DNA sequence: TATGTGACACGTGCCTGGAGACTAGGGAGTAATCCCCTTGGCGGTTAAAACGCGGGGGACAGCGCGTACGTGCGTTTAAGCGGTGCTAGAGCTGTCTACGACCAATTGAGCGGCCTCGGCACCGGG
DNA sequence: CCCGGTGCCGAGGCCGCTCAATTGGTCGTAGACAGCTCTAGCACCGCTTAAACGCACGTACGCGCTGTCCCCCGCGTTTTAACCGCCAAGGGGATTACTCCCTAGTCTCCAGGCACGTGTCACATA
């Protein structure tokens, strides 16, 4: 589970504020529902594309699709400085 | 470690795992899960920055599952996202 | 008195929604007033889909092949509706 | 009063359906399609929750169309529009 | 003579029937309890009743020194009879039923129960239902000193809410007063010591590692370590007035509708087949029309054996009891009383505790000439006392012989002259065979702490052996019934 | 009239005009990328496709105004359609 | 003026088709509206998978797997 | 042929290696293919059925992309199958 | 790789003197490889859901269940059925 | 009226897949256990549902009209069918080289579990 | 509206145990990249002819309500079912070891239909 990770990025946005256990269960639901989904979609993507390998340009281009225009515009920036910083 | 190079929170390791134990490609490249797992944590300091300040209007400390789902409200994009859910109490 | 004929037998379980859980149900919406065939709308309206996310339910316990239903399948066909659920 | 009773059930959240009733519903509806069958209280409760939902959402769009025909008052008319003009007439 | 001489110099405040000796050994066992401050647990039999030897005690502790507030639990039906035994025995004592509405109780706490500590506080009795809802709103206030739990088999689950309840009160002393003293099991032993003895017993593990000639060597470890907490008087060891007791297990063969729904047929399923199939056949069918009582005893069910048994005490000229797990059943009987013309009285769940008292008067009023008088297992079952009735039946047999052997024995108390007889009815090929040799294994935990015969068929002869009571004032196995022997 | 009701449901040609709604689909796509090309089959699946979501809305809010005791449609139940639709965008 | 290249008969038309017998001034406007949000939509998704592919042109396959992915299929194309 | 031993014309072996190219899983049992034959045999013949019978309605020796448009439509069980579904012509 | 010869020989079975067109003919293919695609990504869904590498017979049948509605979900299956039973004698 | 036209049935060389058989090993069917949870009903109370009333807010039927939409004709602007011509860009192929996976050790991360505490309860009133 | 302590009860913090990530190292199969190959999408001048636009109008219609009258809502009774409490069993969820056969591929083989020119004929134009 992704608990403690919720948490701490909790704890960074807002120190003060706690967040139940129910909550806790929801928003770790809630990422793995994204995770599926992103993922599946990748996966098609791939199938359609006749590509085995998968990387972060069909990962990228999952996002665009899922994430409506406005959320995905701000994830795509905070995912090329993950890439540009890890390489 | 992995994650602290790229400097995310979440794990770099168990989004590797999870994408090559759930088969979805028969070969997975190294800037996936780097770049996947900056898209969870942004969605996921997103929605917990408003059902924190949902929170605050209630001046209730804690956040309960009513103030998450007043947040998916609220918001236009994450309603075109979050909108077939429906969250439990 | 004696005979106590007629095992005064309940009511049908799709009348088990009373009127005022409708009224509750309404008035959560936003209804105002309610009208009178309202309530037999909804307990048609409820128990078609009753029936289509238990028959979805039944058949995902049935590629399982186990006896029980369990909340894992609801679940499953609830999403497959277009209506995911959180927390369970 | 009517105004005032709006308020309540949409501040506090809870199962406005009882859970015997609707139990018993789903045993019955579940006993056609297959018999022997048990349900687990997980399930149940999530079906519940569900069904209150979408019942929730259908009396929002009633609502809807109700205030655009100039009628406080909702009538079986306007179920009917709902569900035709959502698509899920079956 | 001494008895008469050792009551005044107990208890005073005692004014009526002087206590006997069994009773003696009772308050002087509860009066060197409470003087050296071990609670005691009472497991004395259905018959010659503990609740005088506890009135007693409690007008003893009245009697001199503080007169704190005293509080009881037992079930509904029984606080009605506590209460007309506690006004009877002992007068210049206050006694209040708390049982009744919210603002019912809010007017009789009011009215009745100072707020401060009086001098006369009358004895509060409420049921499990009542206490476990208001040991933390208005019971927790009230600091009562010594409480007494009647029928100890409520709280024998350690997961019990009422346990809860009850340890959220505060409790100086404690007493539990069972007629059977364990369940076929050791956790639920473990739960009432536990509850009566917090600081004895601590953890069920313990006492499951504690519990041929290794088997011999642990019971006797066990016994000798609850001896001073437990007390047993049995009825023949000490009573020796009342006629003893014969239970007959009467066996009826399967009947042909019986049979045939048996080969067209889980468990639940089966025993409604077994016993009183018609009614439940009927229901399932959706029928609003009800078959005739003759068509039912002719088809359906043991009502041919019961028919036999009922004509038979019409003959004895002796009041039955009868005892049935199910409503259906007690409905069933009901009606078949109705339509024969008997004069029926059923004391269920369903029946006030006004309308119940009423019933138990009437049944206890030697002019009435109701002669069949249904009895519910769960409710009624423990707790009345029917003295008139000496005759009992069972018509189902319950998984714990416990509950089983107290509605049997509910009648055989204290001043029945006439000679009390059990019957018990199972089918034979079903079953009623399990669940019986379930009991049997059951009781049989419980007591160390053939198949030919029930084939075969009761005869007439046989019938009017069985009613023939001169000899407890027949062969151990019996053509079509058996006798069990403890 | 009634009979135009009867020949355009009868017929199955692209009502629209193909120069204009190529120009309208090659104005929007201009906004999100830049120096993009169309294929004439493209083209040809987006008019088809806007088609029929422009004949199903229309027939939507026939409906409502028909239920509105009205023959007049009004943009109040185009309105109302795409709430209850739940494509409000 | 591009969107204006729907013009009024054309709309007229449309509605025929669909059963409406009587149409409003505003109906031109807001079916103008809902036709560009919905033509913004499948548009941004088709310029998506063209981007994915490294592509300049888009093709009518991109547009068949937007118009399915938004629920409406189309067979022919 | 495994296609004439279990009597239906559509191919199995075409089928067998679609699923396997496809990569769906890693591995396809073999009642698989012939079971999934069945099935997509059957929809093309009730399909072919409801739209040859349009046809001959409308006095039309030739099945046009109009007439499978009135059929999908007409048809309760086939409506809810493929939905949204908007033919070319 | 096309079922057009499949198509125009069950289609002679059901209706020998109705003659299919070639749009037509492209439509009915086009139909019958998004049906087994749709029912082939069911049965993956299925599969990894289950945590099943090999994909059965079972699998498919359930696909069938979920996917077709109504009376096409059971005459399909009945099909299957008999084909499985057919091939596996 | 009639024709000729592209749609429809056909051999034909083929040409790239199905089937005909040995295999071999890892996924699937199956005999046994346990104890988590479920089905049924009895007991009681207690808040929740329902039957009967008066009436006042509201759904509904009809009218005069005065804003806006359907219909027809001379007309003007743009859809479109054709034609040339250039060319960025789509698409298939040998490649060779940096990038994904298993495996042996590793060493520290978080899941499993224990204990105290302190934001938030509720109290029944004024 | 705040009131004193109160009573929970999930949150903080710590601990130990350990199976998950990581680094050093080979590789042989996936991919970015120079070339070309032949094909389609870019714009526009020329004619024009069906299609689009606005003024006139006159008549079906959207809107406010006027009267009605009936169909809902709220409150005093009560009366009937949920529900938490609870006894006991037993079908069935969940897991491990086992052994069995079937699904993946390679050597091969012989026929299915796919690209293309052809004789003809049911409308569908005229
Ligand atoms: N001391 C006594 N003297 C006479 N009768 C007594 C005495 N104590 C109890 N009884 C009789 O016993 C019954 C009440 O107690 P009982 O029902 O035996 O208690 P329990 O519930 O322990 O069986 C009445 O019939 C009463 O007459
Ligand atoms: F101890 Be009870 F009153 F039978």
Redesign the pocket.
């Known amino acids: ?5 919720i ?1 701490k990025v909790l704890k960074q946005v807002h120190p003060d504020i ?4 129910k ?2 269960g929801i928003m770790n639901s809630f990422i793995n529902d994204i995770f599926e989904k992103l993922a599946g979609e990748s996966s098609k993507l791939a199938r359609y594309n006749k ?3 998968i ?1 972060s ?1 069909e990962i990228q281009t999952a996002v665009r699709l899922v994430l409506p225009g406005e959320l995905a515009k701000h994830a795509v920036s905070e995912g090329t400085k993950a890439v540009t910083k890890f390489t | ?3 602290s ?1 790229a400097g995310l929170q979440f ?4 989004i ?2 999870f994408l ?1 134990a759930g088969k979805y ?7 996936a899960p780097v770049y996947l797992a900056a898209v969870l944590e942004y969605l996921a300091a997103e929605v917990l920055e408003l059902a924190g300040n949902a929170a605050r209007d209630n ?4 956040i309960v599952p009513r103030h998450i789902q007043l947040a998916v409200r609220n918001d236009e994009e994450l309603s075109k996202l979050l909108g077939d859910v429906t969250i439990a109490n | 008195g004696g005979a106590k004929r007629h095992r005064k037998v ?2 049908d379980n799709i ?2 929604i ?4 409708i ?2 149900l309404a008035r959560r919406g936003g209804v ?6 309202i309530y037999e709308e909804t307990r048609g309206v409820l128990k078609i889909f009753l029936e289509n996310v238990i028959r979805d339910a039944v058949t995902y316990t049935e590629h ?5 239903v ?1 909340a894992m399948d609801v679940v499953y066909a609830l999403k497959r509706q277009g209506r995911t659920l959180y927390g369970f | ?2 105004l005032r ?1 709006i308020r309540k059930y949409q501040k506090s959240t809870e199962l406005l359906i ?4 609707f139990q ?1 519903l789903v ?1 019955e509806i579940a006993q056609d399609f297959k018999t ?1 069958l ?5 399930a149940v409760a999530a079906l519940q929750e569900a069904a209150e939902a979408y019942l929730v959402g259908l009396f929002e769009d009633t609502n809807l169309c ?1 205030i655009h025909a ?4 909702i ?1 079986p008319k306007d179920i009917q529009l709902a569900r035709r003009i959502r698509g899920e007439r079956a | 003579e001494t008895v008469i001489k050792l009551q005044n110099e107990l208890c005073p405040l005692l004014t009526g029937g002087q206590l006997k000796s069994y009773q003696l050994k009772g308050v002087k066992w509860l009066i060197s309890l409470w003087q050296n401050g071990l609670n005691g647990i009472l497991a004395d039999q259905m018959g010659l009743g503990k609740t005088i030897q506890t009135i007693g005690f409690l007008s003893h502790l009245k009697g001199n020194g503080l007169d704190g507030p005293y509080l009881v639990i037992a ?3 029984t606080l009605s009879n506590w209460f007309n035994e506690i006004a009877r025995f002992t007068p210049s004592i206050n006694a209040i039923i708390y ?4 603002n019912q ?1 809010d007017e009789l706490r009011r009215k009745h129960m100072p707020k401060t500590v009086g001098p006369k506080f009358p004895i509060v009795i409420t ?4 206490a ?2 208001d040991a ?2 208005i019971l927790r206030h009230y600091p009562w000193k010594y409480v007494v739990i009647d029928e100890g ?5 350690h ?5 809860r309840e009850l340890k ?1 009160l505060k409790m100086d002393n404690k007493l539990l007063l069972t007629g059977t003293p364990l ?3 050791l956790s ?1 032993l473990w739960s009432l010591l536990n509850f009566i003895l917090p600081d004895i017993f601590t953890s069920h593990d313990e006492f499951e590692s504690w519990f041929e000639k290794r088997r011999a060597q642990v019971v006797s470890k066990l016994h000798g370590i609850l001896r001073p907490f437990i007390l047993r008087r049995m009825k023949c060891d000490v009573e020796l007035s009342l006629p003893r007791k014969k239970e007959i297990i009467m066996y009826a063969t399967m009947t042909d509708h019986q049979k045939k729904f048996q080969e067209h047929l ?3 399923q089966l025993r409604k087949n077994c016993n009183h199939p018609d009614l439940l056949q009927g229901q399932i069918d959706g029928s609003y029309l009800y078959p005739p009582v003759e068509e039912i005893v002719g088809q359906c069910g043991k009502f041919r054996l019961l028919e036999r048994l009922l004509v038979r005490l019409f003959a004895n000229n002796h009041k039955v009891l009868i005892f049935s ?4 059943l ?1 409905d069933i009987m009901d009606y078949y009383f109705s339509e024969k013309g008997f004069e029926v009285c059923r004391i ?6 006004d309308e ?1 008292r009423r019933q138990i008067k009437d049944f206890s009023d030697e002019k009435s000439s109701c002669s069949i008088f249904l009895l ?5 079952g423990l707790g009345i006392n029917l003295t008139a009735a000496d005759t009992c039946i069972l018509y189902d047999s ?3 012989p ?1 509950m089983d052997l107290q509605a049997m024995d509910r009648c055989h108390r204290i001043g029945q002259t006439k000679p009390v007889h059990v019957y018990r009815l199972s089918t034979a090929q079903s ?1 009623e065979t ?1 669940v019986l040799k ?1 009991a049997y294994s ?1 009781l049989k935990l419980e007591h160390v702490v053939e198949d030919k015969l029930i084939q075969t068929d009761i005869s007439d002869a046989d019938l009017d052996r069985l009613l023939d009571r001169s000899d407890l004032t027949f062969p151990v196995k019996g053509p079509g019934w058996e006798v069990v022997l403890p």
């Open positions: 589970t992704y608990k403690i990770y948490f706690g967040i139940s256990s909550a806790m590509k085995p390998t990387t340009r | 470690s992995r994650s190079k794990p770099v390791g168990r590797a795992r090559k490609a028969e070969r997975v490249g190294a800037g001046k209730k400390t804690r | 309940l009511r009348q088990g009373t009127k005022p859980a009224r509750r105002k007033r309610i009208s009178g065939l399982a092949r186990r006896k029980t369990t | 009063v009517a009773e009882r859970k015997l009733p018993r045993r022997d048990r349900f687990q209280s997980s109700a100039k009628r406080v008052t009538m | 079930p509904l039906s049982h009744g509405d919210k109780r049921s499990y239902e009542v476990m809802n933390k709103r088999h409520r709280l024998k689950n997961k019990c809410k009422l346990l959220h369940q076929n099991n639920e889980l468990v639940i797990q199910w409503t259906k007690l269920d769940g369903s029946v006030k505790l119940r519910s297992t769960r409710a009624g319950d998984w714990n416990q079953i399990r379930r059951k």
